[PDB]
Description:
Layout: H1 4-19, H2 21-35, H3 37-40, H4 52-56, H5 59-76, H6 83-96, H7 101-118, H8 125-149
Helix pairs in contact: 1-8, 2-5, 2-7, 6-8, 7-8
This protein binds protoporphyrin IX containing FE.
Protoporphyrin IX containing FE (HEM) binds near residues 42, 45, 97, 103 and 107.
Amino acid sequence: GLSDGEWQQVLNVWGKVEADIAGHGQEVLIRLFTGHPETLEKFDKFKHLKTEAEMKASEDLKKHGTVVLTALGGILKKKGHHEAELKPLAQSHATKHKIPIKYLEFISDAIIHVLHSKHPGDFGADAQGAMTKALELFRNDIAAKYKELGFQ
Ligand code: HEM
């Protein structure tokens, strides 16, 4: 798990996201979709997005970005004690949305990329390390639920 010091960094970094949850949410999804087109196909409500221009101009995409980051933030604030918050998400994404754990890896890297892109020189080595560990814990706990379900 993460140390108290690492959790403090994680939530300090998250402060950046909460100042513009919609903007960060939108960029994360755009980075995910442009970098891994196959992911777009998992969203029937975003498959109509042919170009990045259409993506950036989609208010619903920004809306979902907020839903996604608000959920992740709630989980992060639990500092590891997220069984109740994480279980339902793991279940919906494996059973309903059919999202391979690989796509969670993609969005994890996307979050790291967007933080550096929006806050160049303001996302330190220590901060990236803490945030990375938090995202891996998240991904690892979901992976456990995925194995339980036998979802690949
Ligand atoms: C940081 C990781 C993620 C979080 C916190 C997250 C969160 C959410 C939340 C809170 C919902 C609505 C409630 C439910 O349907 O569970 C949702 C829906 C959904 N998610 Fe995720 N998600 C994540 C990653 C992904 C990834 C990587 C994909 C696939 C590329 C994905 C695909 C979907 C789809 C297809 C829906 C349903 C959208 C709709 O039709 O309205 N999610 N997600």
